[PDB]
Each structure stands twice: as structure tokens, then as C-alpha cells.
Paper text:
[name] virus (TBEV) is a member of the Flavivirus genus, and belongs in the family Flaviviridae. The TBEV virion consists of three structural proteins, the envelope (E), membrane (M), and capsid (C) proteins, and a positive-sense single-stranded RNA genome. The NC is covered by the viral envelope that consists of host-derived lipids into which 180 copies of both M and E are embedded. The fundamental building block of the virion is a heterotetramer made up of two M–E dimers.
Here, we present the structure of a low-passage, European TBEV subtype (Kuutsalo-14) solved with cryo-EM and single-particle reconstruction to a resolution of 3.3 Å. The merged K3 datasets gave a final reconstruction with a resolution of 3.3 Å. The asymmetric unit contains three E–M heterodimers. Superimposition of the three E–M heterodimers within the asymmetric unit, based on the E protein ectodomains, indicated conformational differences between the M proteins located on the two-fold (chain D), three-fold (chain E), and five-fold (chain F) symmetry axes. The major conformational differences between the three M proteins arise due to the different locations of Asp23 and Ser24 that diverge by up to 2.8 Å at the Cα. Chains D and F twist towards each other and interact at the heterotetramer interfaces within the raft. One π-stacking interaction between Trp37 on each M protein, and two salt bridges between Lys40 and Glu33 stabilise the M protein interface. For each E–M dimer within the asymmetric unit, the reconstruction contained two densities not accounted for by the protein model. As phosphatidylcholine (PC) is the most common lipid species found in flavivirus virions, we built PC headgroups and the first four carbon atoms of each fatty acid tail. We built two N-acetylglucosamines (GlcNac) with core fucosylation (Fuc) at the first GlcNac into the density, which is consistent with the TBEV glycome and with previous flavivirus structures.
Numbering used by the authors:
A (entry chain E), F (entry chain D): 1 to 74
B (entry chain A), C (entry chain B), E (entry chain C): 1 to 494
D (entry chain F): 1 to 73
């Protein structure tokens, strides 16, 4: 299958017009939001199990962040 | 003055005895040079282009298939063979398939089958790349005398001049009439790194799509698509667009994965645009470093008489500019050649003149005009032209102006990197140390994280901060935490 | 018989005196059903189809743009407006641009601009979706008797019989000449889950592409593309394929994101293929559940005399079929209608006949007969047809056969799901309990992980395994370990 | 930009001809193996760092497995 | 008795309670079967052959090169190409060469160069692989009555009979004149594994080389040479014999690595030789398991009276056979048809007769004299034929005879493997258990060490022993050391 | 039987064209890596047995190097 990888962002710069807005953290969060609504039941399951089992607030927050970021791309 | 037509205007001011100044000229930007006793000048970079550039390998985007052939042989009679398998312009695949008395053979088992198809590229679905030659590239710089006339953006100023630099270009002098000569020396090869830029042409005929892109070479040379050079007649790796289904006993199907234009344009998201005009290929981004020599400039009309205090009238009342300046235009009735008396005073202190003119020694001439541009301090002011008077509230603040200039400095660093340390500098330790430290640090950081991307880079920054937290001994724990924070901050800022 | 042609075949035997047997027919498969003293039958499912199904929302893949228009107004007046902004079939964007005296505004600042265009899908770049109606779907089952004759895959077998099932007419009787009558009951409500399947068409005259795809309904309803229902003239959300550039002072650019076919076909990677042959829309993957009643079947030629043992000759020597069976073809010259005395002998034993025949009581008849299929035990054996003889080393082993058939069973279970428990059972307790447990567990698993990727499923499995191993008490430890093991096992199995 | 997400792998199945081979265990094993053989030096660096730092066999196995799976990003 | 003509011979005795016996005949071996109540027989396997077997592959051993071509291109331009790159029967390579003004290149750097050459093979330097068909192979067994007459090796014996077993064959009856009939059942496809052996033909007309070799299939498939199939026109992988040197500016050299026959013949060290005879392909090693039935064999001339004791004379005085027997020939002149009064006595006891005769009941007839082969115990003895007498001393001892049979047994077991347990077998626990255990353990060992060299095998044994000595505390250390010893012993003993 | 030994490599040198590249340390290491990739499982078996049975790091390194170097030839 043809697999053209996306062009790198920071290597070229200028002040002329750019073709399109590049990927960004806001785009990432928007995609996560889009995924969560479709997979809410699993979302609640994953959040509740970790929040119950783990002991530390910061650790739980970190794991939740990592899981949410990793969920949609695949 | 063309500089009023755009944002991204920069003011550079010399001092008496300053022979020449260094500028970095950028597409879509311009600088006004002011000197303590010499007329102001407008300098900008108009085009970076080449005529009929050299080509590089072309890629196909929509395969055309024809004349499929298939052959097969029984489980023991050896592998299948087909004539087209050794020719050019053909894609072939050979595999095993089940056989048995259900088909007209002697045994049950895995036989052999081979299929072939002629492949080509459809009429207008081929991407083609061009690369620049350092000995032929042309830079065009333009300079305008900043006369008191005003001319719209679609209309041509009678006084501006052009300098077309190439690798074979010396220091050049532009006359521009009574104001005297100005000199320019632009260092080709100080600008765009032509060794890693490719101009990608897709099809300059379609209506609603830009006519070219400026893609990176390390990205262009690895691309899963059929490719060939200009003179070749047959495509390489046509197998990347054709697919083959699982075989039946005596047949298998040939599939086409269709037009890739939509996935290509999705990949190109962040790339800057370029342009085509007949035989000319233009970049619409980049910069060049150039030294401008002010030595032989003269002020016009220094020996003219002063205009009458009366007999002036407005033509456009004072108005606010985009750059925290005031712009105005006056008309005069009388013996034409003369100097305009222009001044401005803070409200309630008529003894002190506070105007700083961008146009020194304004004049009215036999067929010229009375455009004026000023900078005034914040607050309530009066503007006088002869006996014409007008009140003016200047919005903003000194802290605001300092903030604006600092912000623009940060943006120039972000956009052109270490070259920023050359802008308007007279030389010396500040520029030297800044450029050395910047070049070394940027080189190292680019070496490690060059192509990794925003979010992966941020994630690695978080990982580094976490590692600094995890490391048991406090002092390097804190040092590594600071390193992680710095990488996070920089990858977020850029 | 026909089912020697396929790679995929199964055997089922009616236990002593059983009258009927239940099957799940898998499209692209075969079962041979046999019982003592009953002629052997081949039964298979040939087609699942409907005529002119119902349509569903239709997408667009390549937009065509026309009548681009733009309007703008100065930095202190009211926002711009265009009539096309309120019409249908148009896409528009509203933005702010920088203006000044350079382009004939009276003030410097943010003016307003609006742009519009007309959008219609290109001639042949639509993506139509269809859904089946349970009241109209047709399932076709075919039945063939084991006559003593053989015919190739492109030849018409005279004994082939057809039965077509809808939701009405669930039961039928087929008459088969001398072999009697067979009864078929096939309820369509047990077949494919029609609520979740959509048939996707694109363009059916494009060579080197499949004519249709069988996509999932939830996936089909989530695509970000322009879409409409049948007959409507104006597309919804042309915005997804029309994108706007940043504005100049008084001009703005409209860009077309190009054809999406190549992105779509890459997304469809794993989907099964479907077909269209006119008014008829065929699935090429599905299954049905049936009950076959055998009581009305009877043997042929059971009263004939034996053949003349000296007259036989081979027309094809014995050969392995790949299903653990041997196939043979004999020719004969004596008095025509008679019964063949085939037998087989194991080495190291007293001449006992050990062959098990798939085609019972073979006969030779006027212009017919001579084909034989049989199973032999592992090891060295001899085959006898009258005075004619041959030798055969049957490879494999008993434990090997058990393992082979168990593997086939696991494959069927993982491909067909809960309905596998109905294959070849006499009904009753074991089958019912298996199906109940399977369905109740599978419902929960599908509810929690339906539509999730394999990699995230495996990752969650590993996480659960680790967390259960680390759990603070035995009951929760085992619960978490079991959950992780279950997800890992099912993900790795499917 | 328009994003047409990839079809789920296991929701729909049978024995007919599939369009193309979808992502599966074999494919991902091939990808990770090839990537490691491409990024050897980095692979061994990460592996040894984890093996040295993390205190228990099972947790080392878990972390290494997860990192190797996610490595191609 | 042909058994006398060969270095290798074996005797098997049928106890009176038996009438059929199991043999495994070896090509190049020979067996005498005898039963006290029956005339003795000589049976041997003469040939294993096929006519016009199948061709699997053909390799090439001496490449012919022609019509070399080369082209080059400068650094700033696309790589060179040649039409021969897209034709059959050509091998090509492309590389980078340094160029500059010295070669009219226009710029210093690395350009491109490509070279091509047509490849074929010389008229007689091919190597062809053939494979046998199990349904066409022929095994020839011969039986000789042990007539009592004698003839040299280049003479034809009238009583010799032939049987030609194939897959078609079954138990066959050979009629032997007055001696009666004997039954043979040979199980084709129970001998040499036809799936593992390939017959390799180099050339027929070379005067001083064998006509064919036998080689293993796994080895023959990996010969790393150019290869083809019959009728195909273009060779695959001629790159394995053509080699390319480093390039000059615009020239590249093509080298030929020449004849490979020497290295091939050197690699074949240790493989059995095969033979070719017109259209027939002969193996010269292999074996067949047969059951021979002795019933309906009967003695000749039991009715005759005894000879005139005084008339005998020697034609060839007693001599020692190669197989621990004594051989002699007598002449007689009385009334011809009569039985020979032959006997022998040990020197320590003059009453008991001691001779054991391989000839069942010697007689003289109108044609054909008296040849006798007989066995005696170790020590001093006297042989009598009527009045005629001779004196003999028999070497060796009973312990020596037992030991020699044990050596023979071990050698045969090593050479033939599993089938050794069937030689002279009549069922029973010891034979069955031996075959079962030998099969299991031999298969397990073969699966691990099959194809591995003696030096790696020895090294693994020694390393396992050393590591056992170096191993941890638990008792399993002894088992580890024993495993190393076992592998070493099983490598050394063969 | 005729057995021509392979010409020694280090005894002649120059800058002209050589007939055909001979053995070298880098070539042998390439063969080792290729063999390991071909037989991954056996490599891990050899590694694990010694890692489990030998306690001294230097000894393990020595034995591993010897085994790897001998692997391609055997
Ligand atoms: C100073 C405030 C931000 C600096 C910054 O964040 O600008 C960083 C460099 O920072 C510094 O040198 C500040 C340290 C100097 C002392 C820009 O990065 P760069 O010049 O490596 O890449 C940009 C070069 N392109 C655009 C070609 C990729
Ligand atoms: C606040 C202090 C004034 C900022 C300023 O006035 O410095 C800005 C830019 O400096 C900075 O951001 C550095 C941050 C200050 C530490 C004016 O820089 P510029 O636009 O003349 O560019 C020339 C900038 N070189 C001369 C450094 C290349
Ligand atoms: C060893 C025992 C397996 C016998 C067999 O091989 O039977 C296979 C084994 O099924 C399995 O669940 C194997 C699961 C355990 C592994 C089924 O055979 P089947 O294809 O008739 O499946 C339907 C047959 N029922 C009606 C009995 C389900
Ligand atoms: C190991 C199990 C392999 C089969 C499998 O793992 O299939 C799983 C688990 O098998 C079982 O229930 C057996 C356990 C019950 C006793 C069933 O799920 P399923 O029936 O949806 O499987 C695929 C069927 N589709 C097509 C609907 C997805
Ligand atoms: C103690 C050996 C005395 C008999 C003998 O020496 O047994 C020899 C060779 O049996 C052996 O090798 C046994 C030793 C194996 C180590 C018999 O020789 P055979 O090959 O005629 O076997 C005829 C008897 N079977 C066919 C049943 C073997
Ligand atoms: C036995 C003493 C000699 C070793 C030997 O006879 O080696 C093993 C001994 O087998 C045994 O059961 C030992 C007796 C255990 C009872 C047989 O040789 P093999 O089965 O490896 O040869 C297979 C046939 N070829 C040579 C063609 C590959």
C-alpha cells in the first residue's frame, strides 16, 4: 500500500502563504474528544479501574493522560 | 513609500559617520533606513527565481493498466512461464494455487500460476520535481527614494530602482537622480540553502489549486510511488500501485489502488507555497543578507526658500498608520518650489517640538506633492503645517512600544534563526557572541531532534523531566529537570 | 461429486438410525452427509442476494467548484455581504483583511471580506450505500447425489437440484430420481445479521476494481465527507472538501482538496468483497442454518449381480484428494448393469476389508458409473477391484487426524461464532449449554470491546495482567488476571 | 482536512475474498522486528537502560514489551 | 549358486514349523534361504530403475558472455540507462564513478555508469536433475534353484527366474521346472524414500566420469548456480557467475568466473553412484522388504538309487569358501542317474555323521555334474564321497561364529536402519519392540541433528559434557552430562 | 584430493584494482549478524543457557564472542 508520510513541520519557515494548518496539540485533543464519545463505556471503564486501583493522584493523572493520548491513533 | 502598504515593516536608524549597514531582506517584508543627515530610503526584496530549472525524478499518482495475461501449470509440471515477464513496462506476480481433478489436471495439490499487466501513468497525473542551480539563481532587490509623492499599490512609482544580483554580481550603484547614488552588495549563498529545497509541480493547469510547492529534499527522495527520470520510457516499481488477489485454480485478478492526489495533498499540509510564471520558477519565501552603502546620498531642495505660512490646505487629514505613526498630505498654492514648515507640540507646551519625521526636509516641487509621515509621543498633541492646525490624540504607551519591538525581535529570531544577529548591527561583541552561541546550540539541538515532530518532541521532554525527577541525587536531579523544562519550553515556543 | 473441488470440505455422519441432521452452511464451503444404508449427499449454500436493495446516505469523493465570488469593505464600515451566502449549494467564508491607503481605503486597519463558491460532486465520484431488507433476501441452497459419475468444474451435472429460501417458504422437498426425496428446512432469521451490513458501490464500470464492498454500518455512518440522500440536488457540508486561503487586501483564494478515492480504498483494507451482476446484489460471505431430513432416501441397484471380476481396467489410477481420501476411476466391458466388488486390505492382517466408502454400493450402468472415493486407515494397504489391484501407503496417523479435525473445529468456532455449536449436533443438552454460555459471554465481550483496535486490546490485556499480578489481595488479583487473560486470548485467537 | 478512519479488523468476517490484508499480529511483529534492525543502536540503548533501571523481571518484561510495541510511533 | 560369487552373503533358516519367511533384499547383497524339508533357494535384488524419469531443474556450470555494453552520465544529470536492462538473457549493473574536466564531464563529482552483457551456457556444461515417479518405478528380483550344477559369473544359468515388481504387482508365482513353484510378495514404496533422492546427470559422453550421481533433494535445491527448466529459454540468476569490477571514468570491466565442474565434483565427495543405460535410469543402492512362500517346492530325484561308490573322482578338490563353508566338485562314470553318498566325520568320533549340506540332496544326472557346498564344525575332520576321501581342518570356533554374526547384524543395522528388525522376522515381542523403540528414538535424534556435520556434533557433545561438569548442584547434572555423552557416542559409533 | 588454500590477505597491498574482495573482520561480523537474524531463536537459546549457568561477566562475554564468531562457519 502507498504510505506517504506527513511532512515535518519545523524545518522550513517563511512569511509567505502556507498550504494548510499543521498538526497541533489542539488538533490532538479534538481528535481525543471525538474518539471518547464513540467509546464512552470503555472510557468510563478505563478511568474507573485505574482511579480505584492506583494510590497517588499525580500518578493516576499521568496514566490517564497517557492512555487517552495513546487511544485514538491506532 | 511602499513600506506603508504592508505589516512587518522595520525601522533601522543609523548615526552620523556610519558608512554602511547590514540588512537581512525577507520576502513579504521591508525596512526603512533613516540617517541623521541623509534622505530616508525604502529597501525590499522582490523575487528569488530561476528560469528553466533542472529536473529530478518524476513520480506517478494514477496508474493505467492494460492487456492482462495469465498462465498456469499443474502441481508437478514445474513453474509457469510467460513471455511478458522479461519485458519492460510490465508488472508480474507468480504464486501457487490449488488444483485437482475438478480442473483438467492429473493430481491434487499446489500448482503454479503467473499474471502480468502493462503499466503506464495516466495523461496528467504525474508529480515532477525541480532543483535550483546556485550559479543561475537570481535575486531581485528594489530601492525607493522615499520622495514626498504617494502612489497606490497597483501603480508604478517613477523613482524606484532595481538590482538583479547573481553569483557573478559586484557591488552595484543606483543613481536615482538628485538624491545621489546608493550602493548595494548582496551575498548570494548567504540565503536559502539550495542544497535541500525542491520545487514540486503537480499540474499547473488546474484552476483551484496552487501552482507549486516547496518540499524538503530528504522527504522527496523517499516516497512510495513509481518513479522515473525525464528521458526514460518505462516506469520503475510500478508494483506499488497494482495489487493482486488470491488466485483461483486458473485465474487471478489484477487490482488498481487509484489516484493518490488526495493523500499527497494531505501529506503536504505544512509546506510553503511556490509559484510559476511561464519559464520562471519563483520562491515565495526566503531571505538574503545584503550591505547597503549610504555614503553618496544628498538632501534635495536644501537651498530652496521657505514656503508661505498661509496658502496651505489639507488633501487628506492626519490619520493613524499601521505602525504607530501619523500620515498626512497637504496642498499648496503659490510659487511651487519650497520647503514645508512642519512641527508638532504637546498640548500646553508650545516651546518644545516633539515631532520625529520619517521624511526629513519635506518639500513641494513643480509637479510633486506633500505627503508627510511623523512619530509623536503618547497623549494629546497639536500638529502645525504653516498656520494649518490639527489636534491629535496619540494612543499607546512607551511600555507598549518597547513590548512591540521586543515581540518582533522574538519573531524574527523564530523565523530566520541565527541570521537575526546580523540585522542592523554595527558589529561588535554582542553580535559576535550571540551568533556563535546560537549557531552551536542550534546545531546540536537540530542534530538530536531535527525531524522528530512537535508532539513526540514534547513527549520526550516530559520523559526527560520525569527522569530528572526520578534520578535519586538532588543536584543533577534538578539540573536534568531544568534540561527537560528547557526542551519543553523551546519545543512549545517554536 | 462437486465438493471434491474446493479446498474447504467437511464430513458429518448420522449416528445409528438417526432420521435428520442439522447443519450450518458456510458460503464457500461443503458438507458431505452420510448414514448407513443411505445414499451420500453433498449440500452447499450457493448465493445470498437481493434485487434493487434500499439506499442509504450517499457520499461524494471529488468536488467540482464554480462561480467563485468575493466582496470586501473598508476598516470602519459594515461587514460585507453576498447574495450567494443565503442560497443552497454554496460554501462561503467570512474573514478580516489588512487595508489602507495603498488599496484605496480611507483608514488603516482591519477591513472585512467574504468569499463564496458553488459546489457539486463530479460526474462519477459518488459513493452509494445500500441496505438489505429481511423480507426480500434470497438464500439459494443446492444438493447433489453421489452417482458413480464424475464431471469437471465447467460441466453440468444432471443430478444437481436447487432450493430457494426466503423468510416465506422456509421448508421444501426435493425429488432426485431413483434416489428418492430429501427434505430441507432453512430459517433465514438464523443467517447473516442484516442490520449491521452495508453494500458500498462507488463506480461499477471501473475495470480492475471490485464491484462492491461489504462495510460495517457504524463505520459507514461516521465518514467526514459531503453527503446527501437520493434525489436531492444540494450537497451537505461541501466545507469538508473546500478550504480557503488567507486573504489579501481585496482578494481571497479557494482551494480544492482533490479526489479522495485513494484514501478511501486504503481505509477499506480489511473489508470482505461483494458483487453486483445487474439488478442483483450478491454477498460473497455468509452462512445459514438448516435441518436435512433423510428418511425418504433409498439406494440404487441394490439387487444387481456382481461384476465379472476379470474385465476391469483403470482409467485413472488411485490418487490422494487432500481430504484424507483416495479417488479412483474404473472401466468395464462385461454385461453392463452390475455392482462393483471394490475392497481394500491392510498389511499384516488376515485379508479383512477395511475400506470405508464415501460413495455407497458402486455400480456400472449403461453409459455411466466408475468413480470411487474411499477412506483407508494409516499405513501400508492394498486396493482390489476384481482381479485388478494397486498399492497405497496412507500417510498420517490417528492422533494426527484427531488434531487436524480439532483444528478445523477451532477455526469454525472463531469464524462463525455462537452458531458453530449447532453443527452436526443431535440437539439437546451439551449443544444447548455450550451455545448459551458462549452467547452470554460473547455479548459482554463484544459490548466492552466492539470496534476497538487489536493493538489497544492487547495493551489493555497486558496492563490487566500486570495489575492483577501486583494486586493487593488474592480475589482481586485472580479477577484481574482472568480479565487480562481473556482479552489477550480472544484478541490473539481472532 | 478529511480523515477516513481505518475499518475495524474483527467486527466482520467470513471465508470470501478479502480486499487487502489488514493490520494483524503478524504485520506488527514484522514492523517491530524491522524497526529494531533499523534502529539497532537506539533499540539496544533503550533495552539496556530499562533492564538496568527497573527492579523486577516481570515489570522489565512488561515495560520492554510496551516500548517495543509503541516504538514505530 | 550365485551367492558364491559375492563378497557379501547371508543365510536364513526356516524352522520346520514355518512355511513363509520375511526378507529385506539389498541391492548388491545376496541371501540364501533354506529349510530342512525344502530345497534351498538363492534370491537377490537385481535392479531398481525407471524409464525416462521426470526433470526437476537444470543448473549451468560454465557461463558464456557476449555483446558487452556500457554507458555513463555526468553528476548533474539523471542516471544512465540501456535497453538491455529490459530484455531477456542479459545481466546488468549500475554504479557511481568519479569524473571531471579530465573526462569532458563539466563538473567534478560522482556520476553514473551502467554496464550490461548477454549470458548463456556452453553446449555441454549443463547439470540436469531427475526425479522418479512412484507409479512407474520397477524393482527386479531374481531366484535361482540351487541346482547343484555350477557356472561362472559370465555364464547364463538355465534355472534362473525373474520377477518385475511394480505398484501394479501383487503376490507372484514363479515356476521352477521339476522343483515346483515359489511365491514372492514385495511391497514397493516400502524401500528407498523416493521423495528424498535426486538423480544428477552431468554428461553422458565423458569417458572417465560416472554417468550419474545420487544426491539429496534438500542439497540439490540450494546449489547456488544459474538455473532453468526444460524448454524455458532464459536463465535465472546469471549474476551468480558474472562479476563486475570497479569502474573507471567511462569504462567498466565484466569478468567471468569460469568452469565450476571441479568444485561440484569436489563437493559431491561421499555420495552413492547411479547409472544410466539408454533410456533407463538405475539406482545402485536401496532395498525392498519381501515375504517369500516356500510351499509347493519339492525335492528332485528322491526316487533314484545310490551311485556306484567306487567310481568317483575329484574335479575340483575341496576349498574354503569366503563365508565359512567348504566347496567341492565331483565326477562320476557309472550309470549316470544316481544319488551321491556324501558324508563327513569328526576325527574324535568315527560313528556320528557331522556334515550339514546347503545342497539339499545331491544327485548326478545325464547332464550336469556334482557341485557341493557344506558346513562342518571347527577342528579336524574327514570328508567321504564313497571310496573317495579327503582330509580337512576347519578354522575358527563357535564363539567366533557367534561374534561374526553379531558384527554382521550391527553392520546391517547401521546401514539399513529400521528395516533391520524385519530381516528373518516372524513377528514377536522382541522384533516389534525393537522396531517401535528404534523408530521413536531414531526419529527424535534425526529431527535434531539431521544434516549437521561430524565436527559440530562432536563439539556439541564435548561442550554438553563440560557444561554438565560445570553445572549447578541438583542431580539433573548427571543427566546433562549423559546427554552430551549420548550425542557423542551416537556420532562416533556410525 | 586437490585443495588450494585461500591466499593470505595481509601480505600484499596497493592502490590498483584487486581481483575480488576477500575476507575481513567487518565481513565476518556481517555474516555473524546475518546468521543471528536468520536463526533468532537459536541465538537466544545459546545466550540464555550461558547467562543462566555462568556467573562471571567476563567469562560470559568471552564465551559469547567465541560462539558468535564460530556460528557462521558452523
Ligand atoms: C530568545 C527567545 C526565543 C529563542 C528561540 O526559541 O528561537 C530558537 C533559537 O533560540 C536561541 O538561539 C536563543 C538562544 C540564543 C542566546 C529558534 O530555533 P533554531 O534557530 O534552532 O531553529 C530555527 C531555525 N529555523 C527556522 C531555520 C529552523
Ligand atoms: C526588553 C529589552 C528590549 C528588547 C529589544 O529591544 O530587543 C529586541 C529583540 O531582542 C530580544 O528579543 C532578546 C530578548 C532580550 C534579553 C529588538 O530586536 P530587533 O528587532 O532590533 O532585532 C535585533 C535583535 N538582535 C540585535 C539581538 C539581533
Ligand atoms: C480432542 C477433542 C476434539 C474433537 C474435535 O475435533 O471436535 C471439534 C472440537 O471442538 C472444540 O470446541 C475444541 C475445543 C477444545 C480445543 C469440534 O468439531 P466440529 O467442527 O464438529 O465442531 C462442532 C462439534 N461440536 C458439536 C461438538 C461442538
Ligand atoms: C480461543 C477461542 C477462539 C475463538 C474465539 O476467540 O471467539 C470468541 C471466543 O470464543 C468462545 O466464545 C469460546 C468460549 C465459550 C465456551 C467468541 O467471540 P465471537 O464469537 O464474536 O468470535 C468471532 C465471531 N464474530 C465473527 C462474531 C466476531
Ligand atoms: C548377542 C548376539 C547374538 C545373536 C546376534 O548376534 O544377533 C544378530 C544381530 O542382532 C543384533 O545386532 C543385536 C545386537 C544389537 C546391539 C542377528 O543378526 P541379524 O541381522 O541376522 O538379525 C536377526 C535377528 N533379528 C532380525 C531379530 C535382529
Ligand atoms: C545400534 C548401534 C549402532 C548405532 C546405530 O545403528 O544408529 C541408530 C541406532 O538405532 C537404535 O535404535 C539403537 C538400538 C536401540 C534398540 C540407527 O541409525 P539411524 O536410525 O540414525 O539411521 C537411519 C537410517 N539411515 C542411516 C539411512 C539414516
Amino acid at each position: 500500500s502507498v504510505l506517504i508520510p506527513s511532512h515535518a513541520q519545523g524545518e522550513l519557515t517563511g512569511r509567505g502563504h502556507k498550504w494548510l494548518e499543521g498538526d497541533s496539540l489542539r488538533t490532538h485533543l479534538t481528535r481525543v474528544e471525538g474518539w471518547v464519545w464513540k467509546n464512552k463505556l470503555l472510557a468510563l471503564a478505563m478511568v474507573t479501574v485505574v482511579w480505584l486501583t492506583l494510590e497517588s493522584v499525580v500518578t493516576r493523572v499521568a496514566v490517564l493522560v497517557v492512555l487517552l493520548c495513546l487511544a485514538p491513533v491506532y | 513609500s511602499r513600506c506603508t502598504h504592508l505589516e512587518n515593516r522595520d525601522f533601522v536608524t543609523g548615526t552620523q559617520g556610519t558608512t554602511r549597514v547590514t540588512l537581512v531582506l525577507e520576502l513579504g517584508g521591508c525596512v526603512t533606513i533613516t540617517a541623521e543627515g541623509k534622505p530616508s530610503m525604502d529597501v525590499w526584496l522582490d523575487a528569488i527565481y530561476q528560469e528553466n530549472p533542472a529536473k529530478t525524478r518524476e513520480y506517478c499518482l494514477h496508474a493505467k493498466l492494460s492487456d492482462t495475461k495469465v498462465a498456469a501449470r499443474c502441481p508437478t509440471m514445474g513453474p509457469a512461464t510467460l513471455a511478458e515477464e522479461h519485458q519492460g513496462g510490465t508488472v508480474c506476480k507468480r504464486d501457487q494455487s490449488d488444483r485437482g481433478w475438478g480442473n483438467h489436471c492429473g493430481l491434487f495439490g499446489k500448482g503454479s500460476i503467473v499474471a502480468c499487466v502493462k503499466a503506464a501513468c495516466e495523461a496528467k497525473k504525474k508529480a515532477t520535481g525541480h532543483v535550483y542551480d546556485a550559479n543561475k539563481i537570481v535575486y531581485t532587490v528594489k530601492v525607493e527614494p522615499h520622495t514626498g509623492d504617494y502612489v497606490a499599490a497597483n501603480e508604478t512609482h517613477s523613482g524606484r530602482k532595481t538590482a538583479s544580483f547573481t553569483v557573478s554580481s559586484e557591488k552595484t550603484i543606483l543613481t536615482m537622480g538628485e538624491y545621489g547614488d546608493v550602493s548595494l552588495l548582496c551575498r548570494v549563498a548567504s540565503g536559502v540553502d539550495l542544497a535541500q529545497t525542491v520545487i514540486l509541480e503537480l499540474d499547473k493547469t488546474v484552476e483551484h489549486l496552487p501552482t507549486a510547492w516547496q518540499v524538503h529534499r530528504d522527504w522527496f527522495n523517499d516516497l512510495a510511488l513509481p518513479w522515473k527520470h525525464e528521458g526514460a520510457q518505462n516506469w520503475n516499481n510500478a508494483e506499488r500501485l497494482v495489487e493482486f488477489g488470491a488466485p483461483h485454480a486458473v485465474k487471478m485478478d489484477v487490482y488498481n489502488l487509484g489516484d493518490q492526489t488526495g493523500v499527497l495533498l494531505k501529506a503536504l499540509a505544512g509546506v510553503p507555497v511556490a509559484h510559476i510564471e511561464g519559464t520562471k520558477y519563483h520562491l515565495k519565501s526566503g531571505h538574503v543578507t545584503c550591505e547597503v552603502g549610504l555614503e553618496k546620498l544628498k538632501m534635495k531642495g536644501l537651498t530652496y526658500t521657505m514656503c508661505d505660512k498661509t496658502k496651505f490646505t489639507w488633501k487628506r487629514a492626519p490619520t493613524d498608520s499601521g505602525h504607530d505613526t501619523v500620515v498626512m498630505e497637504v496642498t499648496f498654492s503659490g510659487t511651487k518650489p519650497c520647503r514645508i514648515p512642519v512641527r508638532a507640540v504637546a498640548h500646553g507646551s508650545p516651546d518644545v517640538n516633539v515631532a520625529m519625521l520619517i521624511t526629513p526636509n519635506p518639500t513641494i516641487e513643480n509637479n510633486g506633492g506633500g505627503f508627510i509621515e511623523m512619530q509623536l509621543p503618547p497623549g494629546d498633541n497639536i500638529i502645525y503645517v504653516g498656520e494649518l492646525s490639527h489636534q491629535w490624540f496619540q494612543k499607546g504607551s512607551s511600555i507598549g512600544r518597547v513590548f512591540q519591538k521586543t515581540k518582533k525581535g522574538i519573531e524574527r529570531l523564530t523565523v530566520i534563526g541565527e541570521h537575526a544577529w546580523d540585522f542592523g548591527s554595527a558589529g561588535g561583541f554582542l553580535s559576535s557572541i550571540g551568533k556563535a552561541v546560537h549557531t552551536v546550540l542550534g546545531g546540536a539541538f537540530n542534530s538530536i531532534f531535527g525531524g522528530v515532530g512537535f508532539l513526540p518532541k514534547l513527549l520526550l521532554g516530559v520523559a526527560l523531566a520525569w527522569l530528572g525527577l526520578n534520578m535519586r541525587n538532588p543536584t543533577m536531579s534538578m539540573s536534568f529537570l531544568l534540561a527537560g523544562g528547557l526542551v519543553l519550553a523551546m519545543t512549545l515556543g517554536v
